[model samples]
Target: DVRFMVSLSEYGAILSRFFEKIDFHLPKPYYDSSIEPALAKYIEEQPWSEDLKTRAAKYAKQAVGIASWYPRASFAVRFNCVVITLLVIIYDEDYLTFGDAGTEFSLRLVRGLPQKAPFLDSLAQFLQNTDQYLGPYGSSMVIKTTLEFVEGTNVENDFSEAVPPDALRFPRYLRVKTGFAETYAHAIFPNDTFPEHKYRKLYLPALSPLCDIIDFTNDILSFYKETIRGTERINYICNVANTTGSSALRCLQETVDAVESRVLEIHRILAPYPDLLAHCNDYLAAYIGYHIRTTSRYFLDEVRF
Candidate 1:
């Protein structure tokens, strides 16, 4: 009995560490959701090349974090988000190519539910779990916008071409390429009664500007990594520096103003939906706080990959 009590004490301490493990912005309940146990089990048990296995742990860590921002997100939303995050990172780090290759894997294997490999089998559980909440269409529609992979990839590949994409189109492409579309799509209210016009009006007027803020904030902080990757993301900081021949500091200074203004637009469009507006604020706060920890390796000049 005493040993069991001591083990219980140890378990309590371990649970506390989840909150303290990082400098989270929104923090717990919102920050804490366990999709593990089998998550790690399946990941470890899977067969893969030496390269894939080596980086899979780190990649999974990065992807599962979207759950923290998605504090109000349903179980399936959280599950799908983690699966999408994992699949995208695999494309970026493993495939080592940024065009069509990086954008399509989640939809094809996970959403399509092919169920061929161990990873697919694991992801299938999430899709089925999502279906439980959303029914078939909920699962499909929850991730519907993410299916815009072809559109996003085409724009992303343009950054590598001789002439850059026009300024007007730059932010449009970044939203898709960075997978913010998936994140926002996950935000769509399940069982919402709001008319289609409400969502449509909000998409361009609100969502796009906010994505510019979220995507470029990462770009500005992690500018040096992209510089080395040789894959031009058409990122705000780099694009500004390249086009105007400005110092990175100056480019980033402009970036700050750009984000603040876009956020105001997000605030305007989301005025009607108090919960959605509040959630967006949480996402922004959590994003800023989470990336604070990410700077050490992934966001730095000495980026590992």
Candidate 2:
């Protein structure tokens, strides 16, 4: 019976969840003090008014807390799982173009490979490279800068105390652009040397859950983007860059939502397994969720004006 099958499947799921928890291990706290004040001051001189600086600082603080707990290994594993899951769940969904590159690469890598094989080594390498280029530490900085620019605040002066001499040449825009491209490359073609047939079958089924997460994340990002761009008040702020404040808010909202959703999905998938949940503390969950909820609220609140 279907009921019996579900019961039988539960054990496997529980065991799988346990192993995943062990593999991921909880992350330690890691903070960067410079980001908050920098963001606060940056928002102050913008068209939004000094009051927005307080809100921006609050969001920045929340962001730093989220960033501090995200361990690279845990994040990589969760992302890989989500990518694989999406490819399988939406095998017929033609929305592949909207998916992230890392998700795509995960699909290709696991499509035909055996789950127990050494494919993870290659996947790990890919994740490491991708993280360096587009992960929290890299992308977070870019998001901060984007917020500042959109608010019409001069980051150079706001962050002047900490801005490196090379900061002028190393603008956040360049990092964001490069990071986006690199992420796309990783998702699309994980192993340039190997043909799709070589790895697809082996990796696909095992990673199907990950793919689903990626698709879900993309949906959230899309919603956040559309909402911000369509709003009038936010659009006004964006006009500073010849772009609307709504557009800028949307960008920041998308970043926050993406990160928050991804983290929450991890928690959700891992929740059924008590062992995994046990390893993760309330602080971790709260921190990640706060970023997503707060960022979205911040934009919505400002846009209401």
Candidate 3:
């Protein structure tokens, strides 16, 4: 029992060290008045029945709840994200739940569901309609990451055929693809926000590191909840541990260190562009705070340090 308590405290220490190494900001949560009506109209126009539209609106509000946390994100950025979230929630909700049956369900989703391939069709339409905001780079990344995420559902079937070294090669390969970090990374500097011709070239190098920061920071924050929920083994830290032959506790520590390092690298890369850098810093801080504020989902409030 003492060992269990020590392990608990160790995670708390890791969380503490993570915060200590970085800066954090808490911008007031934002809710633009236009979002609700706009979302409602979008849902109402969908070909689905009244019942599905009602469910879609419910999920839209949930999407807004998550999107509202990004105080620095503009209306377009937040709206696009909320819509993406809505689609995932409305259609792929079961696929998000991990396990073999979930994998098969995801496979069927890709193969085209009965009556109509709603998710895939909607995704294509969304990409075409929103191309203005997402740009070629961002749009392609979105598709790439999403395809990778779906592919991850198949891992369970092949997990037994893997050796320890596969753990090293696979986690990052899968994480970078499946984390959907591109969505936010691109959203961070939308064409309107940063202007493609003027700022995209300047900020190009920072995008990769920024995506890494977004992805790993999420992994670090969600670690505690996954631990409590007993799903840690299927996560990144566990895979890292398997690769390095380290304890999960040690892997968590190293992940924090790596994230901090990447953050500093972003600072250096964007140092010359003060406005862009400041925007990034604000987004990063708020992004971290977003996890804390959504305590009902993440339960991070229960973690004491």
Candidate 4:
């Protein structure tokens, strides 16, 4: 193989040069308020081996930046995001079983059902508080979000073929098949509306572009590691490359183009609701920082580039 892939040294230099441009000043109030303390309580509990516990804690905090966007989130609400994310990491990383990420164990933990599973008891307890605080509507909203994301994970098998060159199909795949759901993003909506069924449909589509940004940025960032390891793995960006025979770099740019074009639509739909609008903007800002934060965790085994 006369590989066109970057020289390992060149890619290493590229990563160094690239990530240095990104920066985040910790939200001190966020840290002092709910961020640091909440995570510490759970991490110190010896949920698993020290190493897994450390990884899970690190993984959860990176997403805490999303919660910082929701300044109005109560300590209970903020704590909900951390524990739920922690369990997701544990489930995805195969802490318990051989099944893939988003397994029933992951779904059960993230769904926050009645029964307390091993190590997830603390996470379940936090969610129970959130459910009571959220009442019926908030509980339903988060539940629906997790299910949709779980449903999206079926794409793991569907990636046997590349996404063809059809535009409509491509965008839709980014929304559903990309396997990214706006999990904790909704906890930012502390305004607490009645949220009719139509609202649920509109709310997600409204922020669809932002979700794409999160999902695709992840796909592009992790594409290298997923590719180097094997053929069986099927990230959508890589699917685009394999199916369309395009470079992974081109697919990544295409992803940006797709996300950028839909910003106005996201703005327009979110306009009438001031809190919802602000969360979108703020989360977008926080997410960039979130990416920079996530690099260290995923860069293990050189998985993130």
Candidate 5:
């Protein structure tokens, strides 16, 4: 329980810091200077601005800078940052509660399972009553919020309509939860949105290559979960060792070692994909790069990290 406490606290702190830094009024000056020139050039170079070149240049520069200060940056960077930040915030606000409750329930389950075979019956009954508040659906409440976190009614509407109908359904590519089963399905039959309805899918196709990287991600999460469970079990065994003489600590230590190894393996596996995807995307968008303007010089920095 205390193990999760530290990690969850760190996650909460990062989320709080992220929100504290997100500016509502405008982009920071450093970001604005980089973004505005590119946008203004796009507008000024367009055919419609022929008679109004002077006026267009002035307004376009102003508009680019104005747009940069707010949420409007280059399309890809703005969309990615907004999604990443929103996911972090939503998880901090809601999913952490589910994790805490789940950990408590799991501890209780472990304790009760040894007393009597019928202990599980009681545990099951208790869990059924509390499941809705702490189960998958509770976790999904946070997920749905993250999925629809961007501004504008149209964005919200599109997400609500498209996500529930296809993506969230079983065997679909957009399932909120990641797992081996979901990854396998995605690999076999990738989702293909209609050209007209493509906007409804948002950045999904553009970000599809990231799907292969999910295996490494799931491995990391599994390692974390196993580490938590092993640590908890070790503590429980140590507390009972004087009387029960259970050498469960050794088993827990082995599990912890395995988990740590897997965590390192996952890190190695995931090291390349983000950089590859970012470069691939940049290459693909090169034709229309003139129309795009990133909010920050560090926009592609995540790939490196």
Candidate 6:
């Protein structure tokens, strides 16, 4: 009986409070960008095989569609966003199919490459552009955070190999690590748009919580679909329940509360700088908007506004 969960409407009601608490608002009528064609052109120019190029082009289109939410973000930033997202999805799919070894090989292609994979050269070129535009810090940080995600995934695979005794502790930490929170957070403040000197130091305080905000927001919004798919056992809310000794439903509610508080904290942190504050708020709104807009992926349309 305890295995039973809430109905779709019930889940919607639960998740609705999160938006209300966050003061969710996505501005105006959305317009499509030429990003897909631009991304497709870039992908086709790569030295990858015809099959790889075609696949990458497809993912690039999807990435740009997602990146479209941050309309304020520059083309360079959005371009890099697609590239990073593409790599993560590809790496994740590799891990899903071939386990740790395939994933390691995926990472190896990024870490070092020449004859083994032409794709690595393309990624290197992308990084070079990232460095030129976003500077050393921006470029290095995404690569660094990406490596952490890969490590977290490998650890997760091993831990789930037999389901670790310390299962409770690892998932919370692993959720943030594998979530790629910092990478996406950093993506918002690209050197060209916000400039490192103007925004980096000012934004650092909120970043600690922004990571949680990002992870938990996604967790809350994604719960319905993930639960529907019967994969909630491996998800954060269930792990949170197990660790905290609470029901999954309440744990989910608690997660919504956590995200609300963090969202407010970010607002408080950036309030003194109006321009920066508005930018941060736009990113958050658009971030949630992206989730809601992607009906096929998140099934958020079932959740009533």
Ranked by TM-score, the better of candidates 3 and 4 is 3
What tens-digit string does per-residue lDDT give for candidate 1 at 159-234?
6642252464555355445554544443444323323444444443565676576666666445554543334435
Q: Residue 27's C-alpha lDDT in candidate 2?
A: 39
**Total clashes for model 4:** 0
Question: Candidate 6 has which clashing residue pairs, if any?
Answer: none
| Global Cα lDDT for candidate 4 | 0.54
- Candidate 4 wrong stretches, greater than 4 Å: 1-30, 43-64, 69-72, 95-117, 120-129, 132-138, 147-180, 191-205, 221-233, 298-305
Residues forming the 10-long window of minimal summed lDDT in candidate 6: 157-166
Cα lDDT of model 3 by residue, 157-212, tens digit: 45543335544677787677567777777777777777777787888899899988
What is the C-alpha lDDT profile of model 6 across 84-183, one tens digit per residue? 6776665565555434453454456555644245654554455546664475666777667766786777666554422343566766777977898888
Model 6 lDDT, residue 56, Cα? 64
Candidate 5, residue 42: how far the Cα is off, in Å: 26
User: What is the per-residue lDDT of model 2 for residues 1-305, given as tens digits with 9 covering 90 to 100?
Assistant: 11111122332343234324424333344444544444444345334325433444444443334333223224333344233222222221222322333333434443643222222223333334444334343333323322332222212234322333333333334223222222221232223222345543332332223333333333232333333333222121122112222233343334334445545565565565453333333334333243234444333223211
RMSD of each: 12.4, 20.6, 4.2, 6.2, 21.1, 3.0
TM-score of predicted structure 4: 0.65
Local lDDT at 236 for model 5: 21
- Model 3 residue 250 lDDT score: 73
TM-score each candidate: 0.63, 0.24, 0.82, 0.65, 0.21, 0.86
Sort the candidates on lDDT, descending order.
6, 3, 4, 1, 2, 5
- Candidate lDDT scores, in order, read 0.52, 0.33, 0.69, 0.54, 0.30, 0.69
Residue 290 CA displacement from its true place in model 3, Å = 1.6
Q: Which ten residues in a row have the lowest lDDT in candidate 2?
A: 233-242
For residues 163-281, write the lDDT of model 4, one tens digit per residue. 45554356356445334355554565542442435455556556456666567655544544555433423566655655566665566556655655555577787788776677666
Off by over 4 Å in 5: 1-76, 96-209, 215-278, 281-305
Whose lDDT is higher: candidate 2's or candidate 5's? Answer: 2
